[PDB]
Write a structure and sequence with these properties.
It comes from Felis catus (Cat). The protein has three helices and two strands. With 111 residues, the chain is mainly alpha-helical. The protein is globular. The relative contact order is 0.18.
Length: 111
């Protein structure tokens, strides 16, 4: 069911990053469910031009599409809290591999 995301790179394991969900509702809501998180994340390979403030849609959107479109077919439309927490949490995991694997290319590399 690919052809247009078909080429997105993905991380090798990274899950349940656990944010400061300093809420009642938008905290417990995810906390009771939090086991079902995706194994990994998608990203485009890092090659110059470090951005997050705009290169968040072009790395989180895709990674959230690949989780919501698999649920929407099941008779769901990801209500705004489920979606908020998704783009919010898929942000800090999809940034973490940007902000931890780039310096690795410069100084580590091949792991």
């Amino acid at each position: 069911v690919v052809g247009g995301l078909g080429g997105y790179m993905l991380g090798s394991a990274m899950s349940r990053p656990l944010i400061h969900f300093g809420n009642d509702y938008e905290d417990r809501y995810y906390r009771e469910n939090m086991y079902r998180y995706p194994n990994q994340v998608y990203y485009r390979p890092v090659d110059q031009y470090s951005n997050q403030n705009n290169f968040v849609h072009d790395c989180v959107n895709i990674t959230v599409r690949q989780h919501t479109v698999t649920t929407t077919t099941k008779g769901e439309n990801f209500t705004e809290t489920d979606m908020k927490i998704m783009e919010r949490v898929v942000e800090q995991m999809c940034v973490t591999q940007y902000q931890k694997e780039s310096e690795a290319y410069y100084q580590r590399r091949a792991s």
